[PDB]
């Protein structure tokens, strides 16, 4: 069954967004068929890859149906697949984030029968809560495509974050990006929100030599020339929540749950407390042997050896004579929770010489997880 | 334009262990002064102290029982201030992305400025993310609300059952500290119910933390939610993914209101079998398949072209923060320095502007063979890929 479809990403800000087990991919890859926003990117890609690469750019042109493209870039990945081939598709942000021709690649390639696999990237999205620093989770967040929300009549609700993307292009399918229709989207914008709530204009830095763009625009400006030449087929809009919807009381008893300036009295507290605080309980800090680190790391990097790890975990694990007996042991179970066992001790077991019992490896909880909320 | 003054840089570690890791932030792990980390795997936690300058702290050290979270988060925050307030190059990682569910950070980053320090996030791999490669399906193709389940709750929000939703913390719903339970899951499903009637399917999400984790990715109808070995399956990584049950129909007179042809009559497709699936090869895309081939563009297009001075200046000042400062201080005396640089690429890089690099960067391959190099003009003069449609 050779041949076989990976997809990634290359994430937003020149170079730098890659993920590692991505550049580890560009690599390894038999052909890499890519589409980014920046040459410095694009020769990165290029120059760090085995030399066999295709610029899925070249489908587009001015008058062409965008469309007609996506399924034109899905199908030259999908041709090298099925000739054998381990093919890479690299799209910027996150490849399947607002992107049509690579779970349209993914789905086609499972369903004759190849092996097919997205990996994350960063997104606009990512890029915008880094950047405007929100916290989604606060309120909730929805995303939305700008002409799609126009087509299906939907209304945005102003107790959310909501996230417009798109917006340079209402309305257009192919190539032509004049603006012609970003006045429909204000109306929406203007019937949910009112003319005097604020915007924000987010566009993230592509290159070094770029500059965030995060101009706050009352809604009542939106439809002055000067501000609406400013808006790209890279702009995306944050709307901000106009009015949070209350707590309702009830449900907090329900849940069980109980009925500003930087340095008040409860930080000053905490902060007092900093250096003198002293845990209930001894905690646990990272112990692991050289083999178990080297082997932890080739997993992450190299699919291959993650292969023959699957395979078989005892063997695999007999290739590595550095590691110590409880870390064969606990690899060769083949689950998290005995990782989370051997590459963690408690310092005073450490300074007892004392190695986690059969029984402790293999009692693990595989679950974990701390909560930041 | 500084020598000496500390800054704040917070970033994320991703969900998967390691791989999930930038390359702007590995660089950082590398010349950071001091690290300070929260993560959840020991083969991520080793890389980073492996890759770092030695002085690093566990800020998970921070949390106890019986202590409050709240507590805790201003000791996270604090510990980075001091270091940056010391004058020290500061790295703050936390897993997935570094500000979605995470409270100190924005403090950290809040105080950091107001104090007049530089103090930045960089994005990481989210939970989100990492379901949208996991379970195949694309936001835009419906809109996607996400949100917390306890906050939907506590708000009484209604969840709209023609869009995308995803739900955090299905877990522990309305409990924090670290007695994560399933007691109060029950007015999830109750929220569901209503929502969506008790055929409708969700998918419990966990994606792979470790190399011996495998993706959960298990598909239950609502009604299944309450049984026993159900709810035995949902920790406190799971997320929900509720596909749309009632996508909106599109409004044939808004497609003729914003230009789009009359052909406009379905949404863009959907490809994990929750939704109707079009055939992958029906007459549209044979068509497109067909030209393939033979299509040629209207107009020659540019190729990347630069200088090996060009890409390794741009390489380091994706990653080296400390040279992007230098440039920026002094572009054109910068750009003097590396003499292996075009005429036009060190006019280029002297503007400190996207758009003349963009010119110096690419040309067509007519202009690249007849030697012919963008004008000073072409350069001096800064006045598109996307890759969905709705039709
Ligand atoms: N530099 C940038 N800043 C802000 N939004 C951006 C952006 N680049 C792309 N976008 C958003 O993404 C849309 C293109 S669709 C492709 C998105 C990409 N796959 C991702 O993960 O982000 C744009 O119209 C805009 O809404
Ligand atoms: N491995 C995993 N797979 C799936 N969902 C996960 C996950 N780890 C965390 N989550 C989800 O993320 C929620 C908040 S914790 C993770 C926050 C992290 N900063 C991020 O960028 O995503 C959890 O309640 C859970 O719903």
Not at 261 to 275: F, S, T, W
Request: proline share 6%; hydrophobic share 40%; glycine share 6%.
């Amino acid at each position: 069954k050779p041949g076989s479809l990976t997809i990634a990403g290359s994430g937003i800000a020149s170079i730098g967004h890659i993920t590692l087990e991505t550049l580890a991919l560009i690599k390894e890859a038999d052909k890499i068929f890519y589409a980014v926003t920046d040459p410095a990117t694009e020769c990165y890609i290029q120059e760090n890859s085995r030399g066999d690469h295709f610029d899925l750019t070249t489908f587009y042109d001015t008058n062409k149906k965008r469309y007609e493209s996506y399924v034109q870039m899905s199908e030259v990945m999908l041709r090298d697949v099925r000739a054998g081939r381990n093919v890479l598709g690299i799209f910027y942000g996150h490849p399947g984030v607002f992107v049509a021709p690579s779970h349209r690649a993914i789905a086609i390639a499972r369903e004759e029968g190849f092996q097919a696999k997205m990996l994350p990237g960063i997104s606009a999205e990512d890029y915008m809560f880094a950047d405007l620093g929100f916290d989604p989770s606060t309120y909730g967040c929805m995303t939305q495509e700008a002409t799609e929300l126009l087509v299906r009549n939907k209304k945005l609700d102003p107790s959310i974050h909501n996230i417009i993307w798109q917006v340079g292009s209402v309305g257009v399918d192919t190539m032509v990006f004049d603006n012609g229709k970003f006045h429909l989207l204000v109306e929406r914008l203007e019937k949910d929100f009112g003319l005097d709530h604020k915007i924000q204009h987010y566009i993230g830095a592509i290159l070094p030599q770029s500059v965030t763009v995060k101009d706050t625009f009352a809604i009542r400006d939106l439809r002055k020339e000067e501000v609406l030449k400013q808006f790209t087929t890279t702009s995306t809009f944050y709307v901000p929540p106009r009015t949070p919807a209350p707590i309702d009381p009830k449900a907090v008893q329900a849940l069980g749950l109980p009925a500003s300036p930087a340095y008040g009295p409860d930080e000053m507290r905490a902060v007092a407390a900093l250096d003198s605080f002293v845990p209930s309980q001894e905690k646990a800090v990272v112990h692991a042997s050289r083999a178990m680190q080297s082997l932890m790391v080739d997993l992450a990097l190299r699919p291959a050896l993650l292969e023959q790890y699957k395979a078989d975990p005892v063997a695999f694990a007999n290739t590595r004579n550095g590691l110590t007996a409880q870390e064969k042991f606990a690899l060769g179970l083949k689950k998290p929770g005995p990782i989370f066992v051997v590459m963690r001790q408690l310092p005073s077991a450490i300074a007892s010489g004392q190695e986690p019992s059969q029984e402790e490896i293999a009692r693990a909880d595989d679950a974990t997880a701390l909560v930041l909320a």
